[PDB]
């Protein structure tokens, strides 16, 4: 029998004949002995029992920079509502009864962690209505402006040696983006605004919470009022959009960053034979995750593990350094120059695609949320004051071809180097040279350095920031756009896309029960921050489709003159033509990670195959694993890109689907097919211009299938050299009128759709032809 979620707290079971079981509608929130403010966040089936995640709309969390116990629930005003994971069972019809109830307590904070948290600042979440221009921030100081000062041009050649930028050909390379304007950056104790600038290069107060609350917020309220009578020339009102992505409010005002971080961090559920794993959502970053031992006592506090303590394998040692060297500056000299890189932490947040389990293994994926240092000096003063220190790390044109050599390339490892370079009859934004290489021949090794003047080394305060997108540098320039859309190509006979190693990074992997126990120890460590190691992980440069932006039509080395033009080179300039329910065409999104075991037989004496699929902007990604080792699939040749990752573009039908309305991902064991359910009723009621939405009705379903030569099929296929892929195809189940309840996969050859057009229910039976549906009107009972 199949289970259906009637609403945010009720669950109704159906027989395989698409008929509802009488007296089966159960209120699990009531059953779990939880109050009205709670609703079911995620549900999964393990060991035949139903595991349910619950989260309260009434949760309140505080961050106190002073003290030992910094992150805590606000007891005082009935905000001590932690999230719970409950095991339920059938005691028979359907009669649910609670087995175990686990609470997810806030994270513990060390002395070292709290020194980053004290001055940690966070970007306002990205919305359905957030533009390329809202995201855009004013360009920072160039390399020669930081280390040398103003009017120090054509003196670079003689002075670059002292500042340890020996032979560096890019004085004009940007050092980051200014934080005096643009999208709001807030402390954990501070709250985010309902307003978002239309142009971040001009409107906005960035990290200046004080300057916003005193003067700018009032201009914003006047331009962009809530419900319209408003002008909407400088600002967008996204209260409705924010609310739809899980933002908690005290009427009109959102709760502080820390509360939003908690509520969104308890979004996805995975269950193994010994552990329960809880991660965040795809909308906003997750700085921690929960590992709950299933053997935990009735009233014990289950604490999360920080991502800043979870050391991942980025594929290569160099790939990890790239991410870390940009997290901050690593030479305190000051005293309060605390950031993540200095306090010896790793990547602190991820925008989680999802989490699942196969053969007691946990599988995760997501995009790495951009993180860089920033100056907070407050005065003469430092040249980098009120600015983020981020840069492009895209592989140089002169680099050796072959995946391993492209990703290990020392281009932009310690400091900035990319810009705009004229090559023959075209151009590039990536530095043409690395090592001893110059146009004349060999000139001595090229050096890079963190954008901090060595004279101002002591009198500088480099603290930490976290972005709401997979973008590290938002600085309004050429290279920012090519790194975001994947438009950097080499010029050698065999073309290759030069990847970035900090911007639009997709991280994925498989976690063992012992790798999870390690994670649990780190959460329970008191005093020192204990470090975790996840071996079977990988990273891959996954950018947004270039054709989601107006003005770009191909991806080649040769670039047309019109493509050096400002209108299609900077963020504010760039215009979106993306149809996937996002106003921006620059930041990538991922959702619906689901793994499954292949029904097709494998060679005798070999373990059954299993893979995972996930949806990203522009296509479907497939994660390939070796079952004989429960590791990521790999191959002998380093020149070929890790065979554990595959990407297949969408067509206009799949691109048309609003990725922000993802409801549920399912997998049919007998078919080997994934059903992606999108409910249009998950749309915000109003635009950024407060205009009522008129397309929040209906649904859509996408089928995902395996393609390619699979492992251990025969003597030849015991090893692979090509990554097996996936195929996303609009199933044929869709509506614009009906409001979906759920989809029953009745059989391999049949499916049932439960919906309401005018309150009354309707069961639609669709004919299934190996992932392709067509409605049966005869099957109406």
């Amino acid at each position: 029998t199949f289970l259906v979620k009637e609403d945010s707290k009720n669950v109704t079971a159906y027989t395989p004949f698409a008929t509802p079981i009488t007296d089966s509608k159960s209120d699990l929130v009531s059953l779990a002995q939880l109050d009205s403010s709670y609703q079911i966040a995620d549900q999964t089936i393990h060991n035949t029992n139903l595991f349910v995640l619950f989260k309260s709309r009434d949760v309140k969390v505080k961050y106190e920079s002073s003290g030992s116990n910094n992150i805590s629930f606000d007891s005082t005003s009935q905000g001590e509502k932690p999230s719970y994971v409950v095991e339920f069972t059938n005691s028979t019809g359907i009669k649910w009864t609670m087995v175990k109830k686990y609470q997810l307590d806030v994270p513990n904070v060390s002395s070292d962690m709290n020194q980053v948290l004290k001055n940690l600042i966070l970007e306002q979440p990205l919305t359905k209505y957030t533009l390329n221009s809202s995201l855009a921030k004013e360009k920072g100081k160039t390399q020669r402006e930081v280390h040398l000062g103003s009017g120090q041009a054509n003196q670079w050649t003689s002075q670059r040696n002292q500042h340890d930028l020996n032979n560096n050909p890019s004085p004009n390379a940007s050092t980051g983006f200014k934080l005096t304007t643009g999208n709001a950056y807030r402390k954990l104790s501070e709250s985010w605004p309902i307003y978002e600038p239309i142009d971040g290069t001009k409107q906005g107060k960035g990290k200046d919470s004080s300057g916003w609350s005193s003067t700018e917020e009032n201009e914003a309220k006047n331009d962009a009022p809530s419900v319209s009578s408003g002008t909407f020339n400088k600002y967008l009102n996204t209260k409705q959009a924010l609310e739809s992505i899980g933002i908690l409010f005290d009427d009109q005002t959102p709760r502080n960053v820390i509360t939003q971080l908690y509520y969104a961090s308890t979004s996805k559920l995975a269950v193994t034979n010994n552990h329960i794993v809880v991660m965040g959502n795809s909308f906003l970053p997750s700085m921690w995750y929960w590992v709950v031992e299933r053997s935990a006592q009735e009233n014990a506090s289950n604490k999360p593990t920080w991502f800043a303590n979870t050391n991942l394998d980025w594929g290569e040692d160099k790939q990890k350094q790239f991410v870390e060297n940009q997290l901050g500056y690593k030479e305190t000299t000051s005293t309060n120059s605390h950031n993540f890189h200095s306090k010896s932490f790793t990547q602190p947040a991820y925008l989680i695609s999802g989490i699942d389990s196969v053969n007691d293994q946990i599988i995760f994926s997501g995009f790495k949320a951009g993180s860089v240092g920033y100056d907070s000096s407050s005065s003469s003063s430092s040249s980098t004051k009120d600015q983020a220190l981020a840069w492009s790390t895209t592989t140089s044109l002169d680099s050796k071809t072959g995946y391993k050599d492209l990703v290990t390339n020392d281009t932009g490892l310690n400091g900035p180097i990319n810009g705009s370079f004229s090559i023959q009859d075209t151009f590039s934004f990536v530095v043409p040279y690395s090592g001893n290489h110059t146009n004349n021949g060999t000139t001595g090794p090229i050096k890079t350095a963190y954008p901090v003047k060595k004279d101002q080394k002591s009198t500088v305060k480099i603290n930490s920031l976290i972005n709401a997108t997979p973008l590290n540098s938002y600085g309004d320039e050429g290279i920012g756009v090519f790194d975001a859309l994947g438009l950097n190509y080499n010029f050698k006979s065999n073309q290759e896309r030069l990847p970035s190693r900090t911007d639009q990074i997709f991280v994925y992997g498989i976690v063992s029960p012992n790798e999870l126990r390690s994670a649990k120890s780190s959460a329970d460590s008191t005093g020192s921050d204990t470090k975790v190691n996840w071996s079977n992980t990988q990273s891959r440069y996954l950018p947004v489709p270039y054709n989601y932006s107006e003005g770009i039509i191909d991806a080649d080395g040769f670039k047309r003159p019109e493509n050096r033009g400002a209108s299609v080179t900077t963020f504010s300039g760039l215009k979106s033509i993306a149809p996937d329910g996002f106003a921006n065409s620059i930041a990538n999104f991922s959702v619906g990670l689901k793994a499954g075991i292949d029904p097709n037989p494998v060679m005798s004496g070999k373990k059954a195959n299993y893979g995972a699929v996930v949806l990203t902007r522009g296509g479907v990604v497939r994660l390939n694993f070796n079952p004989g080792n429960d590791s990521l699939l790999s191959t002998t040749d380093n020149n070929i890109a890790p065979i554990s990752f595959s990407f297949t573009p969408f067509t206009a039908a799949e691109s048309a689907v609003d990725l922000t309305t993802f409801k549920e991902v399912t997998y049919n064991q007998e078919s080997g097919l994934w059903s992606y359910i999108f409910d249009s009723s998950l749309k915000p009621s109003h635009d950024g211009k407060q205009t009522p939405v008129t397309d929040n009705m209906g649904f859509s379903v996408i089928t995902v299938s395996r393609t390619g030569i699979e492992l251990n099929q025969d003597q030849a296929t015991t090893t692979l050299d090509v990554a097996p892929s996936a195929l996303a195809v609009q199933s044929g189940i869709q509506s614009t009128t009906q409001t979906l309840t759920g989809v029953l996969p009745l059989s391999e050859e049949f499916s049932a759709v439960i919906a309401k057009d005018s309150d009354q229910n309707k069961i639609d039976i669709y004919k299934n032809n190996n992932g392709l549906f067509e409605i049966d009107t005869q099957l109406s009972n």
Partner: protein
């Protein structure tokens, strides 16, 4: 029912089917069988009577004259019974159970209803041409029946079965419209107005050069007229050269070609189409045979499923500007105009013009053009096109698909019938019920992206929401290569030869490019005639008169020259492009000087594959004949899952007017009540040849030989020693690319070696012998009196804020603009491209690449190797590089020498045919063929070799696909085995001898040839399969020094053919054959050709590939040069031949045995000592 000895086996020419290897419980074979009776003359049947009353008259005659069946053979190849529908007296259908499952006992046989199958009287006399077996249902088979007429097509009377081309002096230009358009004095207000000022909006740079042109479009309010419609503006009109010189299908097509039967005619005349009959068969039972379902392959099922944009093919998504530009330029309009492809049109050549395009054109008021109106010219599926789509069945699940054949059943010398799509017969209720449908390949191949191939990239295989690219095939077959379902053969690409557009005033001097765009010259190869090209093929007619005189070198519209191209400098871009900001109702024509050669032209305006599906902004036209090899792995479960009918939306339709067209998007969200997007990703992966790209591929083309000779294109084994035809390595001089254009950031960027040296190749430009690294602006293009172009002139300069006024042109330029130029550093100066390389591969295999001719072999007009052909003086006219007229991508002299047109390579006595770059007087040349008649439709049986490999007969070569299913690093992935028979190689109809290819028990594929079966041509010029109407070329006298510094200048060639009598005689294949010493059979035998012996390490070119010491192209050339005498090691060689007595007609193949003509059937020695114990004891 008993085996009739008078009926012997045969092979149908369209699908090359002869017999089916039957597997499972009861193995054996199901082979074709026919009466080999002569004393048959179709002449008796008299032609008033229309095409249909005549055809039934031929049918009734052939019925009492010809006998056909499909006999069943056991595993030993011994025949068992016949199954002859015409001799079947009172046939019966199977007795089905209560679930539709037929009643059957292994011994008693099948249960018979006694009642004959549906439409039996019309299918009764049909000829079975193919047999396929059910994959999961036992004893279930399916036959492909066609009418007896389909087999005797070419033997029908000439008044009924026609040619698409002409039969006192011969002139190839008579049927061509060559008179260039002129200035319209009345329409001078229809000129695109220059803007008043650029926009500053944070810009800074400035220029004195003429401002951008403005193109305004406004809707307003009027049902039939727009407020503004500047794309409709046309300040030019046709020439009045003793009449208006335009495309008129009525004036120009008197005895116009029309198909045998229209689409409607075939669908209503059930005996004139193709049928599929499902049948039952169990040989070791009493009732061994029984019939099931009879389904007619209705053409309307395919036509009803054609994209909506196909109802109006004389139009495309660019609308009125492109209709006008192409129209005046005396070109075909749209994406599939009937003047180029009359085979898919019910009224054939009657509709072969640009008139009635489905949208209003040429209105007295221009703001009325572009609006949707009535048409009567849609892409349909008539007789010739229809039967070419018949053959190659596949049984996947409960479905039977027909992917079509090579089209040899209905193919004429000047016609190219091909398969447009796939047909599906979906069976239900234990095969008791059936449903017929058709899907066009255009939809099915919509999902193609570059990541799906390991060979050539950016091939013209792209498309859009309006399905403008119309892929059609010459199918080999569709077979399971292990786990993977593979569809192979040759494929028609998007057009590349007519991508460049001529400047309105150049038509007369560029006759071959005009011919090609007019459907007169059915050539698909890019011809090198670039002087007259317009800088951009997307410039509307409104902008063509801006610089009529030509003194200011028309910034918007000028004669294409990549020397006068501008910088990419931020200030050049600011001043001349970003300054002008387009709006909702206005677009600009920038004063920026864009220009580039064949590579550049194709990069911007060809339907090149990207990383995304349906991303082709421009699909020019569609090729005449299949011009690419093709193998693709299909999605079997998508083919069986997809719905019968396909629903398109308003997104697949062209805009009703120019206002709606103006702000169109290349991609749109499909309607929720449509399913057309579901059909896009049926192809999983594809291959077009060996796994090589760009310059690396060229090296391989040199390595292969020409069938007619056996001599390579390289001419490498023994400065005045011949040079290669397709490669630049060691040809010309070594130019340092760090000294070209901006001369910055080049050293390690393109070459991973210190030395940035690149071979110029034949026909280069240098300042002097000493100065070979970059040519300074001293090939500066001058224009007609007060001539020189002036860099440093007020217009040709950009002043940024601060006043440093700098010129926009480049100081130095690459050292070659020849048809062989291959610049890794300059795309604007590259002529060699991937689309040409793909065509050049297939053509060289067929051995049909044309050569440019000046001197025939005749007296007082001969070409002498010594003193006339200097291989050392390749920079000058002595080298004899035409630079105008020849095939782009090669060295014309190197090809002539390979063809042995001059030299001892083909004839002991030198034929003295060639090309002389004249320094004396104006040259007059014509392109001619090789003497070979192989066609890109000469595609045989698909032959699965093993679990990882497959191959087929393509012309005189057996091509094998080594590295497609599971590719290996370092291999080319292709094997080639050439036929040895010189009479077949040099035959007029060479593919008439081909009698099918089969995989043998020893594990090698073999092919049957019967040279006695060679058909003779029925026939100033004489039509053969490789006949092309090449137009004359006339150029000014060549310079003695600094020859190729400039693009070679042509002159009016409209009155030139009258002095080319000798040359024009060589357009007929038989006349080339005669001069080459191949005149007549001067012999053969009929036997079987076997492939070259191949080992797992055959094709290992890994050593030749990669490296930085020498560039990949340079390392492969040295490697191929070290392997000239052991080509068998790379997998290029000659096929071995075994003589066979008598006349080869077919083969009977069982999973145990392959018997030619079904001879040699034995008892099998192994199982002779094993028997049953008799029941009595």
């Amino acid at each position: 029912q008993a085996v009739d000895e008078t009926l012997t086996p045969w092979t149908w020419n369209n699908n090359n089917f002869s017999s089916l290897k039957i597997t499972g419980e009861n193995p054996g074979s199901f082979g074709l069988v026919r009466s080999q009776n002569d004393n048959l003359n179709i002449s008796s049947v008299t032609k008033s009577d229309d095409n249909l009353k005549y055809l039934n008259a031929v049918e009734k005659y052939l019925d009492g004259q010809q006998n056909f069946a499909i006999r069943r053979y056991d595993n030993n190849g011994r025949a068992l019974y016949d199954i002859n529908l015409a001799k079947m007296e009172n046939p019966s259908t199977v007795q089905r159970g209560l679930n539709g499952e037929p009643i059957f006992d292994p011994f008693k046989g099948f249960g018979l209803t006694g009642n004959a199958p549906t439409d039996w009287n019309e299918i009764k006399g049909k000829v079975p041409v193919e047999v396929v077996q059910s994959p999961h249902s036992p004893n279930l088979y399916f036959v492909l029946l066609v009418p007896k007429v389909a087999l005797e097509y070419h033997n029908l009377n000439n008044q009924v079965v026609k040619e698409s081309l002409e039969v006192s002096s011969f002139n190839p230009t008579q049927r061509l419209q060559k008179d260039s358009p002129v200035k319209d004095s009345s329409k001078q207000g229809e000129k695109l107005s220059e803007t008043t000022a650029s926009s500053m909006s944070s810009g800074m740079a400035t220029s004195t050069r003429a401002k951008a042109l403005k193109v305004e479009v406004e809707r307003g309010s009027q049902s039939d007229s727009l407020l503004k419609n500047d794309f409709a503006k046309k300040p030019l009109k046709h020439k009045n050269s003793s009449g208006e010189v335009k495309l008129e299908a009525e004036k120009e097509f008197t005895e116009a070609w029309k198909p045998l039967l229209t689409t409607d005619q075939i669908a209503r005349e059930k005996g004139m189409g193709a049928t599929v009959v499902s049948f039952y068969d169990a040989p070791y039972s009493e009732n061994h045979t029984a019939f099931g379902l009879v389904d007619h392959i209705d053409p309307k099922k395919m036509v009803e499923n054609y994209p909506p944009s196909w109802k109006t093919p004389k139009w495309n998504h660019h609308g009125i500007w492109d209709y006008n530009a192409r129209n005046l330029l005396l070109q075909t309009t749209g994406f599939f105009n009937p003047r180029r492809h009359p085979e898919w049109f019910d009224e054939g050549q009657a509709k072969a013009d640009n008139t009635s395009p489905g949208f209003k054109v040429g209105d007295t008021d221009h703001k009325k053009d572009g609006f949707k109106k009535n048409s009567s010219s849609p892409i349909a599926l008539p007789f010739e096109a229809y039967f070419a789509n018949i053959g190659n069945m596949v049984a996947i699940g409960n479905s039977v698909f027909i992917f079509g054949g090579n089209g040899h059943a209905t193919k004429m010398f000047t016609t190219n019938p091909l398969s447009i799509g796939v047909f599906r017969i979906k069976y239900t209720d234990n095969f008791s019920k059936s449903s017929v449908t058709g899907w066009p390949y255009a939809v099915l191949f919509g999902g193609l992206i570059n990541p799906q191939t390991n060979g050539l990239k950016d091939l013209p295989l792209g498309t859009n929401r309006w399905f403008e690219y119309v892929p059609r095939m010459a199918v080999s077959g569709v077979k399971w290569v292990g786990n993977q379902l593979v569809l192979a053969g040759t494929l028609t690409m998007g057009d590349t030869a007519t991508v460049p557009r001529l400047k309105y005033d150049q038509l007369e001097k560029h006759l071959n490019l005009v011919a090609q765009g007019q459907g007169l010259l059915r050539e698909d190869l890019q011809i090198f005639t670039p002087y007259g090209w317009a800088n951009r093929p997307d410039i509307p007619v409104g902008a063509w008169l801006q610089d009529e005189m030509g003194s200011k070198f028309g910034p918007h519209y000028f004669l294409n020259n990549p020397d006068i191209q501008d910088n990419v400098n931020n200030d050049t871009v600011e001043a001349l492009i970003s300054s002008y900001k387009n709006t909702d109702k206005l677009k600009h024509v920038y004063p920026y000087r864009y220009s580039g050669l064949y590579a550049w032209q194709l990069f911007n305006w060809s339907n090149k594959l990207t990383n995304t599906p349906l991303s082709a902004n421009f699909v020019n036209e569609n090729s005449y004949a299949p011009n690419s090899l093709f193998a693709a792995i299909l999605n079997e479960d998508l083919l069986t899952g997809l719905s019968d009918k396909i629903f398109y939306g308003k997104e697949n339709e062209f805009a009703e007017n120019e206002a709606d067209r103006f702000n169109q998007l290349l991609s749109l969200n499909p309607n929720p009540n449509t399913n057309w997007a579901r059909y896009l990703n049926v192809v999983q992966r594809f291959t077009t040849g060996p796994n090589l790209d760009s310059s690396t591929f060229d090296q391989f083309l040199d390595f292969l030989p020409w069938i007619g000779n056996g001599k390579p294109f390289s001419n490498s084994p023994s400065s005045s020693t011949p040079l290669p035809t397709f490669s630049n390595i060691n040809v010309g001089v070594k130019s340092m690319i760090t000294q070209h254009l901006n001369k910055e950031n080049t050293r390690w960027v393109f070459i991973p070696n210190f030395s940035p040296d690149i071979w110029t190749g034949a026909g280069y430009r240098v300042q002097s012998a000493n100065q070979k690294n970059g040519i300074p602006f001293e090939q500066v293009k001058p224009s007609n009196n007060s001539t020189p172009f002036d860099p440093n002139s007020d217009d040709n300069k950009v002043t940024p804020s601060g006043g440093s006024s700098k010129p926009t042109t480049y100081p130095a330029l690459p050292n070659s603009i020849s048809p062989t130029s291959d610049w890794i550093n300059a795309l604007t100066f590259t002529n060699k491209n991937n689309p040409q390389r793909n065509q050049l591969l297939l053509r060289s295999l067929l051995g049909t690449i044309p050569v440019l001719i000046n001197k025939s072999g005749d007296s007082n007009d001969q070409f002498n190797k010594d003193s006339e052909q200097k291989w050392d003086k390749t920079e000058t006219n002595e080298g004899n590089l035409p630079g105008f007229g020849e095939v782009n991508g090669l060295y014309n002299a190197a090809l002539l020498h390979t063809y042995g047109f001059f030299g001892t390579n083909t004839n002991s006595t030198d034929p003295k045919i060639g090309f002389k770059a004249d320094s004396s007087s104006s040259s007059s040349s014509t392109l001619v063929g090789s003497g070979l008649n192989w066609t890109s439709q000469d595609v045989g049986n698909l032959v699965v070799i093993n679990d990882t490999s497959f191959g087929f007969q393509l012309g005189g070569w057996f091509i094998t696909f080594t590295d497609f299913i599971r590719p290996r690093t370092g291999y080319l992935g292709i094997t080639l085995s050439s036929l040895q028979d010189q009479t077949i190689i040099w035959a007029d109809q060479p593919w008439t001898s081909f009698k099918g290819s089969y995989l043998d028990s020893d594990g090698t594929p073999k092919s049957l040839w019967d040279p006695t079966a060679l058909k003779s041509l029925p026939n100033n010029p004489t039509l053969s399969p490789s006949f092309q109407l090449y137009q004359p070329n006339k150029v000014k006298a060549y310079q003695t020094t600094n020859t190729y510094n400039k693009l070679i200048e042509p002159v009016d060639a409209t009155s030139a053919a009258t002095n080319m009598t000798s040359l024009l005689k060589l357009l007929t294949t038989k006349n080339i054959k005669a001069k080459l010493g191949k005149g007549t059979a001067s012999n053969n035998g009929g036997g079987v050709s076997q492939t070259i012996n191949t080992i797992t390490t055959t094709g290992n070119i890994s050593e030749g590939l990669k490296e930085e010491t020498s560039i990949q192209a340079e390392t492969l050339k040295k490697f191929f040069d070290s392997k000239q005498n052991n080509k068998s090691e790379i997998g290029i060689g000659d096929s071995t031949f075994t003589k066979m007595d008598g006349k080869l007609t077919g083969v009977v193949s069982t999973p145990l045995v392959n018997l030619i003509n079904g001879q040699g059937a034995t008892s099998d020695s192994d199982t002779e000592k094993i028997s049953f114990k008799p029941g009595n004891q």
